Amino acid sequence: TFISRFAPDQPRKGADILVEALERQGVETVFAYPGGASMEIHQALTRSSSIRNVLPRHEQGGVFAAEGYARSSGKPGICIATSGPGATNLVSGLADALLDSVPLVAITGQVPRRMIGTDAFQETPIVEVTRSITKHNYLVMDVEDIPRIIEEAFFLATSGRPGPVLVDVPKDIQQQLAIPNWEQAMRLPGYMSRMPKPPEDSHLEQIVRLISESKKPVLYVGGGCLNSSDELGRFVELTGIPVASTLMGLGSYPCDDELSLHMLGMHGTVYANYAVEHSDLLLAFGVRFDDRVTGKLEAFASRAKIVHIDIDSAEIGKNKTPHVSVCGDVKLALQGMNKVLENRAEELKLDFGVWRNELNVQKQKFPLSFKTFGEAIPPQYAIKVLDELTDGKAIISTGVGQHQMWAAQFYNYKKPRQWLSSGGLGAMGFGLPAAIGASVANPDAIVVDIDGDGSFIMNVQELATIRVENLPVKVLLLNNQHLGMVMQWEDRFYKANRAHTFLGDPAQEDEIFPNMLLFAAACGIPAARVTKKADLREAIQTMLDTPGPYLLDVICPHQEHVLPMIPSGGTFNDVITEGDGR
Amino acid sequence: TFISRFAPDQPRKGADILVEALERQGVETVFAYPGGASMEIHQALTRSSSIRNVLPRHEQGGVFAAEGYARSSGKPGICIATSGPGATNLVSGLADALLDSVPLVAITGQVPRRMIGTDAFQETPIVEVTRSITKHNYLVMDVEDIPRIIEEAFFLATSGRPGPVLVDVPKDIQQQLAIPNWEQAMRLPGYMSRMPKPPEDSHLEQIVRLISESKKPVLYVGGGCLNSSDELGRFVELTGIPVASTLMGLGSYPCDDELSLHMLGMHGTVYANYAVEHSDLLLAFGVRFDDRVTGKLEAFASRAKIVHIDIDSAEIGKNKTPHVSVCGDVKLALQGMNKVLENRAEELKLDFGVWRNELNVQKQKFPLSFKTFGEAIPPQYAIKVLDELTDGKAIISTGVGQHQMWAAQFYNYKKPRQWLSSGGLGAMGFGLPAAIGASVANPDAIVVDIDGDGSFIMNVQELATIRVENLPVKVLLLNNQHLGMVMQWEDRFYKANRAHTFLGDPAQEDEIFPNMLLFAAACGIPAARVTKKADLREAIQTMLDTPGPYLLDVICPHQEHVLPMIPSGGTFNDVITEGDGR
Amino acid sequence: KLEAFASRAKIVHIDIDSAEIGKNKTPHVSVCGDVKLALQGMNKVLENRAEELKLDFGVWRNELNVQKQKFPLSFKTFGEAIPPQYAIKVLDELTDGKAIISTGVGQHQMWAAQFYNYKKPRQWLSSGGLGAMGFGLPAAIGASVANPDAIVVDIDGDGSFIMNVQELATIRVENLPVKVLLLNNQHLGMVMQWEDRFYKANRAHTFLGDPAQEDEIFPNMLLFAAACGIPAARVTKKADLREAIQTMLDTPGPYLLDVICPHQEHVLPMIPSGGTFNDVITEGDGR
Ligand SMILES: Cc1cc2nc3c(=O)[nH]c(=O)nc-3n(C[C@H](O)[C@H](O)[C@H](O)COP(=O)(O)OP(=O)(O)OC[C@H]3O[C@@H](n4cnc5c(N)ncnc54)[C@H](O)[C@@H]3O)c2cc1C
Ligand SMILES: Cc1cc2nc3c(=O)[nH]c(=O)nc-3n(C[C@H](O)[C@H](O)[C@H](O)COP(=O)(O)OP(=O)(O)OC[C@H]3O[C@@H](n4cnc5c(N)ncnc54)[C@H](O)[C@@H]3O)c2cc1C
Ligand SMILES: Cc1ncc(C[n+]2c([C@@](C)(O)OO)sc(CCOP(=O)(O)OP(=O)(O)O)c2C)c(N)n1
Ligand SMILES: Cc1ncc(C[n+]2c([C@@](C)(O)OO)sc(CCOP(=O)(O)OP(=O)(O)O)c2C)c(N)n1
Ligand SMILES: Cc1ncc(C[n+]2c([C@@](C)(O)OO)sc(CCOP(=O)(O)OP(=O)(O)O)c2C)c(N)n1
Ligand SMILES: COc1cc(C)nc(NC(=O)NS(=O)(=O)c2ccccc2OCCCF)n1
Ligand SMILES: COc1cc(C)nc(NC(=O)NS(=O)(=O)c2ccccc2OCCCF)n1
Ligand SMILES: [Mg+2]
Ligand SMILES: [Mg+2]
Ligand SMILES: [Mg+2]
């Protein structure tokens, strides 16, 4: 039972109604950078004893932090920005959150209402700009709507298919006095009317049926199962079906597990893509048949009965047509199928050990492999050591590129919400701020940003934030002086012709440039470099043992190539398994 | 007569047609950060001998660089980005360019056409997102349209009221072979049909008439006169009317000149706002009656016959209703009025010396003034010294906040395109990248980014770009450890209650944090700090004399307040002239 | 052509919508506000400074009254055929210029503009910007309900009239005294006129009658009126016109008068689209 800081009949500013609306939602943390159009909100925040502001150094930093907070916790992330350039600096964060179905509530100051449309100081039509890159947005036109709109935005951000919701609040509404009414009903008739119902046993039994009739089943698991870790585990033991996961699903099913095919898709393991190529039953739980995963669709699971369980009806049959479909919460579907399974255990007598054996042969012929050249540090090996020394218990955020694939391939996520990575938009500069949010959400966790030198520098300014907020963020910076992923494609398809993919200084072409250690020094963050594979393990141990934030600059030969690789739009028969830039 | 690198009958990739389309436009410089959806364009660029790519470290860096290039030269600035997060990182740049009427051509890679709408890898509907923050945009749907669309985008970006135009190019169009047709006509019937005609002498004579009938005339000059420096100078000598300028007009009329009222508006000089308050004839040339400038509109030039000459009919009578109006190029209007004036010189016998005297009394009672406390460096003084030691010849870019007002107030711009500053959006992080573009456009100029510590850090990563491109950018970093402008408003209107406006480290509350010198060191840029006013002049001299880029960290007491200040929406009678945060 | 329009005038534009000011022609002076106030203010100044001004434009007014005399609006009368212009003029005469006039769109609309003398505003109800056919009959229905004691006449054309002919049911049932002066030429006349001037009188679907019985008035608008119990009559001879219209006016309740007219008439004068004054057509028709 909530206790306000205002008399139930005492008028207060709209800014204060808005902060209390946040408190009544359970918010403890927001990422807010102040500006003229949001100064009132920032004053109202200083008056809240229960909400902490982490002030970033760039609003993109702020929104990416709110994403990290969300992805690492299952709570919504909250960023606040001023109008104009404040608001426009959130846009990559919003698009990112929408594509990965991450729950986010973005609040932006706006010019006073009478000023809207007039090309006023620091005005941009942010509700127009973001309409196609948010799940929903709002322009508050009256202080009386603040309670109801905040409640609707949280409800839309976190229910159904989660995603970002943006609320534009004009400065004059922030200043208007009023007495909030917290009993207002929500105005979401259609949306609520279309929320999926719990699954019918009609559909659930038909699936358990198809399982027993099948000889080569594969689970195809994605971001939609991140709240189903236990149900999915139970489901796997009652059926012993092997588990392939998407980039977003990592850690739903434990990475180090005998039944685990690891990740599928363009950079999936040879065995996981094999399982799908030759399966007869494909259990697509919480996935969206993305082109990174399917390649040529006609070729994808070309001879499988496809069971698609998704909470968003628009996803069902959108790229691949399922045989069976179930529009609902995969967590419920698993709970129902698990009852049927355990009960009808005997009549079913489920044993796929013979299919599991065909795959463990591929798993043995074609494991993920890396070369070690001289004393040069292999990035794959560095991640593997980080896994070893953290006992697979760290929260890992990443940038985008080769280092991201390696952090996917060579770290064993045990639980969901350990892996924080931009999958759909693929936004560089995500790693450092996302670690900031994950740390604040998980103050006792090991938090490591496995970053690349291009991605890392894009939001390097957030090192100030880490230092000032005294967050124990570790940065494992895999440094190859290149935009490596674009470099790799230059190698395969453009005859290694380099078009602006080198990040160092051509004049001193053999010096590590820039010197990330000095970036850390500028913000008072202990840091070290390491070049010889011999020194790697003690280097990483040092990073882990040194209390507080820490940057480790890990130098790596740039000619590495993420493998395997099915070229864009290809089939399994096109999978590249060998080669690099040498 | 252009020479292609391809036979006139030889098919080439769409990417190559696009680069040649740029060459045929005169482009020599582009700011492009490569990604998957634009790799083809980057390969095509490496094949051009006449186009240089400055690779930034963040696409916001790239677009702000293209703005700097444009604003410092009068040529269009060209940035290129990949799809998805590349494109969304341009958005603040586009909005900025649109609000300041800066000519810009932004090219973004897009997913292949067949993929559009499918939530494909790194897809965002950028044409939707940017429609309201660009002058116009395009989604190329066929390689045959590349010549015509590039020609239309440059023509729209640079003609009329200049602004940003964005061209989205799907990856498959970049790869398609074709034979360009460079003779295609442009499809802009309506736009071309509505281009203003040259001014009629009917309207021009009526204005010169109103001048002779008037006793207290004021010129009100803005960004629209940046190509009219000579005509406007001539016009001022034939009439001796005093000249007030907006933030965007600085340097149209020379800052150090007896007839110069300097800048008007919310932080305008007391005398310039006085001239307007009490004028009877207001010559509004190339301005848009912005709220920063007018305050309460009914009070603005409340007793003046208002003559508004603007090239955009939508601006005329949009906030203040003119008596006379002229929709056309102010440069022509000046050339016409100058003929009438010089001819009818005798019959007119124009002498405003008595009004000019009333103003030179205000100019003497209420000049811009700053205090000097002990040995603490006053920011105003540092800018004045920079002016002295550069002889008013530097190109000055800035961030946003107090330091921006000071760079406006205490530097004497002699010509237009010396002052590069975000006026309408007011986007922090603009200064460093804008200096990068201005330097590349003006390789023999002194280029100085007068920046604040909040703004500077937002795009600190572009120091890598400065170093690698061996650009002689000087950074005069005015450091007060605060978001000073929001701090100032906290002081006046919120009882100095600080809500997240302190940028240093609360734990070591008296150390300069971060240490910008180490940011410079990381990128191999010579740097120094300075704290004592005694050392300032030799410090700045050093920065200027040291070849190549250079950062000077100038420490400043934070309690300074930009003055004078007419509070938002006020009248002249409300002008604050005294006070700070002490 | 805008460049040609008032090419040598100081233009004063008083409009209540700022978006209209300088949108197609650039004024010298502008005033964004209610023209009613602007007139009240200028009228005070005028009456006060009457003497110092000594305003006399009689010499310009004379230059124009010469044009007004050389080039008045004119129509031919062929035999006993009813000229539409004349029928409207008679309606004006017999109503004393006091009727509320709604119209359809086309030639008949221009004639109702040219040959009726509106004395006050809100007497003339006509679709000007969209130019929507079928507007006349329903618009008269609304005007009648708003002005139950007024003479209400829908000066309509046979194409426009039929488009919303169903509203005759409404007139009858609501017992509205709507009079219909239907100028009938069996053609989409305005498109016909343009066919004549610019397409060599080649007819593309502008004939509204029955090609099989090519000389019978088709349809028979009198029966449309009969279906809804509205008294109606036709008239073909100019001799019978004045008594016909008088009958329509004197018969209480709604009434339809079908006025047959030679179709070769042309609304004049005409400045062709996008032209200047120097291009004004003043003579000619479809004969
Ligand atoms: C450089 C790079 C390379 C990449 N290559 C690969 C690759 O080789 N393999 C790969 O897998 N990815 C790859 N991607 C990532 C990729 O583009 C997509 O982000 C990923 O494939 C999609 O993950 P997903 O299918 O799990 O769907 P998500 O984006 O995780 O969406 C979850 C789905 O589940 C649904 N859902 C959500 N909640 C529930 C619920 N409670 N119940 C039921 N359904 C729910 C949503 O409606 C949606 O359909 C790569 C990314 C990058 C940057
Ligand atoms: C912190 C801060 C404080 C500020 N305070 C002030 C202040 O005190 N004073 C101030 O002046 N600004 C101030 N501003 C800047 C402000 O918000 C606007 O950017 C500025 O007032 C508008 O400049 P402008 O009127 O010249 O119009 P611009 O944005 O420069 O537009 C130019 C105008 O001229 C027209 N035009 C362009 N080319 C031509 C041509 N060839 N012929 C004719 N017309 C043409 C365009 O159609 C447009 O109407 C401040 C900004 C910030 C960030
Ligand atoms: C904001 C932004 N701009 C450009 C991008 C386009 N991409 C990529 C891709 C995969 O999306 O292909 O397009 S990955 C990549 C290069 C990675 O830089 P690194 O981290 O230092 O090196 P690493 O060795 O790969 O680990 C670029 C330039 C992007 N996604 N985001
Ligand atoms: C991307 C962005 N985010 C927030 C902004 C809102 N504003 C400002 C304003 C004037 O627009 O009022 O809103 S100015 C300002 C603080 C200036 O930081 P400094 O340069 O280090 O210090 P200085 O001492 O003022 O020189 C902020 C936070 C902005 N415009 N852009
Ligand atoms: C819904 C609709 N459809 C077609 C139209 C296009 N126009 C016209 C115009 C002037 O807009 O030129 O386009 S006028 C006209 C023909 C008039 O038919 P009439 O009333 O019986 O004959 P009258 O002898 O001209 O009085 C047509 C077909 C229109 N405006 N509205
Ligand atoms: C230098 O200018 C500053 C600086 C600071 C710190 N704050 C303010 N505040 C206001 O201008 N408030 S405003 O009156 O409501 C207003 C009036 C008109 C258009 C937009 C408005 O608000 C949004 C503007 C940014 F806030 N202005
Ligand atoms: C890791 O994935 C990478 C990495 C790199 C460097 N490049 C590519 N290129 C393609 O995917 N080209 S694509 O086939 O036309 C394509 C297919 C589907 C959706 C979008 C597509 O393009 C835009 C994607 C980004 F480019 N993919
Ligand atoms: Mg790298
Ligand atoms: Mg500062
Ligand atoms: Mg007709």
JSON list of N, CA and C in Angstrom, two decimals, chain B residues 197 200 202-203 206 209 313 316-317 321-327, chain C residues 3 7 9-10 18 21-23 25-32:
[
{"chain": "B", "resi": 197, "resn": "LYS", "atom": "N", "xyz": [10.78, 34.36, -57.58]},
{"chain": "B", "resi": 197, "resn": "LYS", "atom": "CA", "xyz": [11.32, 35.13, -58.69]},
{"chain": "B", "resi": 197, "resn": "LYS", "atom": "C", "xyz": [12.17, 36.26, -58.14]},
{"chain": "B", "resi": 200, "resn": "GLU", "atom": "N", "xyz": [10.63, 42.45, -57.56]},
{"chain": "B", "resi": 200, "resn": "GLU", "atom": "CA", "xyz": [10.15, 43.55, -58.38]},
{"chain": "B", "resi": 200, "resn": "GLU", "atom": "C", "xyz": [10.59, 44.88, -57.79]},
{"chain": "B", "resi": 202, "resn": "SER", "atom": "N", "xyz": [8.90, 47.47, -57.90]},
{"chain": "B", "resi": 202, "resn": "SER", "atom": "CA", "xyz": [7.72, 47.88, -57.16]},
{"chain": "B", "resi": 202, "resn": "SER", "atom": "C", "xyz": [7.94, 47.73, -55.65]},
{"chain": "B", "resi": 203, "resn": "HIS", "atom": "N", "xyz": [8.21, 46.50, -55.18]},
{"chain": "B", "resi": 203, "resn": "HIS", "atom": "CA", "xyz": [8.41, 46.27, -53.75]},
{"chain": "B", "resi": 203, "resn": "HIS", "atom": "C", "xyz": [9.70, 46.92, -53.24]},
{"chain": "B", "resi": 206, "resn": "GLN", "atom": "N", "xyz": [9.30, 50.75, -52.62]},
{"chain": "B", "resi": 206, "resn": "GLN", "atom": "CA", "xyz": [8.49, 50.99, -51.42]},
{"chain": "B", "resi": 206, "resn": "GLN", "atom": "C", "xyz": [9.31, 50.86, -50.14]},
{"chain": "B", "resi": 209, "resn": "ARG", "atom": "N", "xyz": [11.62, 53.78, -49.85]},
{"chain": "B", "resi": 209, "resn": "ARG", "atom": "CA", "xyz": [10.72, 54.86, -49.43]},
{"chain": "B", "resi": 209, "resn": "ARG", "atom": "C", "xyz": [10.56, 54.87, -47.92]},
{"chain": "B", "resi": 313, "resn": "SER", "atom": "N", "xyz": [8.35, 31.50, -48.39]},
{"chain": "B", "resi": 313, "resn": "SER", "atom": "CA", "xyz": [7.07, 32.16, -48.13]},
{"chain": "B", "resi": 313, "resn": "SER", "atom": "C", "xyz": [6.43, 31.69, -46.83]},
{"chain": "B", "resi": 316, "resn": "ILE", "atom": "N", "xyz": [7.08, 33.98, -43.93]},
{"chain": "B", "resi": 316, "resn": "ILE", "atom": "CA", "xyz": [6.61, 35.36, -43.94]},
{"chain": "B", "resi": 316, "resn": "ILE", "atom": "C", "xyz": [5.28, 35.46, -43.21]},
{"chain": "B", "resi": 317, "resn": "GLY", "atom": "N", "xyz": [5.22, 36.34, -42.22]},
{"chain": "B", "resi": 317, "resn": "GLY", "atom": "CA", "xyz": [4.07, 36.45, -41.34]},
{"chain": "B", "resi": 317, "resn": "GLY", "atom": "C", "xyz": [3.73, 35.20, -40.55]},
{"chain": "B", "resi": 321, "resn": "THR", "atom": "N", "xyz": [3.61, 39.71, -37.95]},
{"chain": "B", "resi": 321, "resn": "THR", "atom": "CA", "xyz": [3.04, 40.06, -39.24]},
{"chain": "B", "resi": 321, "resn": "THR", "atom": "C", "xyz": [3.77, 41.27, -39.78]},
{"chain": "B", "resi": 322, "resn": "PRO", "atom": "N", "xyz": [4.42, 41.18, -40.93]},
{"chain": "B", "resi": 322, "resn": "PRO", "atom": "CA", "xyz": [5.13, 42.34, -41.47]},
{"chain": "B", "resi": 322, "resn": "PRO", "atom": "C", "xyz": [4.15, 43.33, -42.06]},
{"chain": "B", "resi": 323, "resn": "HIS", "atom": "N", "xyz": [4.60, 44.58, -42.17]},
{"chain": "B", "resi": 323, "resn": "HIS", "atom": "CA", "xyz": [3.86, 45.55, -42.97]},
{"chain": "B", "resi": 323, "resn": "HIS", "atom": "C", "xyz": [4.13, 45.24, -44.43]},
{"chain": "B", "resi": 324, "resn": "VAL", "atom": "N", "xyz": [5.37, 45.48, -44.86]},
{"chain": "B", "resi": 324, "resn": "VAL", "atom": "CA", "xyz": [5.89, 45.06, -46.16]},
{"chain": "B", "resi": 324, "resn": "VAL", "atom": "C", "xyz": [6.49, 43.66, -46.05]},
{"chain": "B", "resi": 325, "resn": "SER", "atom": "N", "xyz": [6.38, 42.90, -47.14]},
{"chain": "B", "resi": 325, "resn": "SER", "atom": "CA", "xyz": [7.05, 41.61, -47.25]},
{"chain": "B", "resi": 325, "resn": "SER", "atom": "C", "xyz": [7.65, 41.48, -48.66]},
{"chain": "B", "resi": 326, "resn": "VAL", "atom": "N", "xyz": [8.69, 40.65, -48.76]},
{"chain": "B", "resi": 326, "resn": "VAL", "atom": "CA", "xyz": [9.33, 40.34, -50.04]},
{"chain": "B", "resi": 326, "resn": "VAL", "atom": "C", "xyz": [9.82, 38.90, -49.99]},
{"chain": "B", "resi": 327, "resn": "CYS", "atom": "N", "xyz": [9.19, 38.02, -50.75]},
{"chain": "B", "resi": 327, "resn": "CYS", "atom": "CA", "xyz": [9.59, 36.63, -50.79]},
{"chain": "B", "resi": 327, "resn": "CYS", "atom": "C", "xyz": [10.63, 36.48, -51.89]},
{"chain": "C", "resi": 3, "resn": "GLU", "atom": "N", "xyz": [1.82, 35.99, -62.57]},
{"chain": "C", "resi": 3, "resn": "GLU", "atom": "CA", "xyz": [2.68, 37.12, -62.93]},
{"chain": "C", "resi": 3, "resn": "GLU", "atom": "C", "xyz": [1.89, 38.20, -63.65]},
{"chain": "C", "resi": 7, "resn": "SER", "atom": "N", "xyz": [-0.74, 42.98, -62.28]},
{"chain": "C", "resi": 7, "resn": "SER", "atom": "CA", "xyz": [0.69, 43.10, -62.53]},
{"chain": "C", "resi": 7, "resn": "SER", "atom": "C", "xyz": [1.26, 44.45, -62.16]},
{"chain": "C", "resi": 9, "resn": "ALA", "atom": "N", "xyz": [-0.23, 46.61, -59.50]},
{"chain": "C", "resi": 9, "resn": "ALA", "atom": "CA", "xyz": [-0.99, 47.10, -58.36]},
{"chain": "C", "resi": 9, "resn": "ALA", "atom": "C", "xyz": [-0.21, 46.85, -57.08]},
{"chain": "C", "resi": 10, "resn": "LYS", "atom": "N", "xyz": [-0.27, 47.82, -56.16]},
{"chain": "C", "resi": 10, "resn": "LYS", "atom": "CA", "xyz": [0.05, 47.57, -54.76]},
{"chain": "C", "resi": 10, "resn": "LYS", "atom": "C", "xyz": [-1.06, 46.73, -54.14]},
{"chain": "C", "resi": 18, "resn": "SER", "atom": "N", "xyz": [-3.37, 33.09, -41.74]},
{"chain": "C", "resi": 18, "resn": "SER", "atom": "CA", "xyz": [-2.03, 33.51, -42.14]},
{"chain": "C", "resi": 18, "resn": "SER", "atom": "C", "xyz": [-1.47, 32.65, -43.27]},
{"chain": "C", "resi": 21, "resn": "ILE", "atom": "N", "xyz": [-1.88, 34.20, -46.67]},
{"chain": "C", "resi": 21, "resn": "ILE", "atom": "CA", "xyz": [-1.24, 35.47, -46.99]},
{"chain": "C", "resi": 21, "resn": "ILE", "atom": "C", "xyz": [0.09, 35.21, -47.70]},
{"chain": "C", "resi": 22, "resn": "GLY", "atom": "N", "xyz": [0.24, 35.80, -48.88]},
{"chain": "C", "resi": 22, "resn": "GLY", "atom": "CA", "xyz": [1.37, 35.55, -49.74]},
{"chain": "C", "resi": 22, "resn": "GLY", "atom": "C", "xyz": [1.55, 34.11, -50.19]},
{"chain": "C", "resi": 23, "resn": "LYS", "atom": "N", "xyz": [0.45, 33.35, -50.30]},
{"chain": "C", "resi": 23, "resn": "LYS", "atom": "CA", "xyz": [0.58, 31.96, -50.72]},
{"chain": "C", "resi": 23, "resn": "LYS", "atom": "C", "xyz": [0.67, 31.80, -52.23]},
{"chain": "C", "resi": 25, "resn": "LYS", "atom": "N", "xyz": [0.06, 35.02, -54.54]},
{"chain": "C", "resi": 25, "resn": "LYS", "atom": "CA", "xyz": [0.52, 36.35, -54.91]},
{"chain": "C", "resi": 25, "resn": "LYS", "atom": "C", "xyz": [1.08, 37.04, -53.67]},
{"chain": "C", "resi": 26, "resn": "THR", "atom": "N", "xyz": [2.18, 37.76, -53.83]},
{"chain": "C", "resi": 26, "resn": "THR", "atom": "CA", "xyz": [2.81, 38.36, -52.66]},
{"chain": "C", "resi": 26, "resn": "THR", "atom": "C", "xyz": [2.24, 39.75, -52.46]},
{"chain": "C", "resi": 27, "resn": "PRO", "atom": "N", "xyz": [1.61, 40.03, -51.33]},
{"chain": "C", "resi": 27, "resn": "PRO", "atom": "CA", "xyz": [1.05, 41.36, -51.11]},
{"chain": "C", "resi": 27, "resn": "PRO", "atom": "C", "xyz": [2.16, 42.34, -50.77]},
{"chain": "C", "resi": 28, "resn": "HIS", "atom": "N", "xyz": [1.87, 43.62, -50.99]},
{"chain": "C", "resi": 28, "resn": "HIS", "atom": "CA", "xyz": [2.73, 44.66, -50.45]},
{"chain": "C", "resi": 28, "resn": "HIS", "atom": "C", "xyz": [2.45, 44.76, -48.96]},
{"chain": "C", "resi": 29, "resn": "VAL", "atom": "N", "xyz": [1.26, 45.26, -48.62]},
{"chain": "C", "resi": 29, "resn": "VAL", "atom": "CA", "xyz": [0.72, 45.24, -47.27]},
{"chain": "C", "resi": 29, "resn": "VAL", "atom": "C", "xyz": [-0.06, 43.95, -47.03]},
{"chain": "C", "resi": 30, "resn": "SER", "atom": "N", "xyz": [-0.02, 43.47, -45.78]},
{"chain": "C", "resi": 30, "resn": "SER", "atom": "CA", "xyz": [-0.85, 42.35, -45.36]},
{"chain": "C", "resi": 30, "resn": "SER", "atom": "C", "xyz": [-1.44, 42.65, -43.98]},
{"chain": "C", "resi": 31, "resn": "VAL", "atom": "N", "xyz": [-2.57, 42.01, -43.68]},
{"chain": "C", "resi": 31, "resn": "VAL", "atom": "CA", "xyz": [-3.22, 42.12, -42.38]},
{"chain": "C", "resi": 31, "resn": "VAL", "atom": "C", "xyz": [-3.89, 40.78, -42.08]},
{"chain": "C", "resi": 32, "resn": "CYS", "atom": "N", "xyz": [-3.35, 40.05, -41.11]},
{"chain": "C", "resi": 32, "resn": "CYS", "atom": "CA", "xyz": [-3.93, 38.77, -40.72]},
{"chain": "C", "resi": 32, "resn": "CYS", "atom": "C", "xyz": [-4.97, 39.03, -39.64]}
]
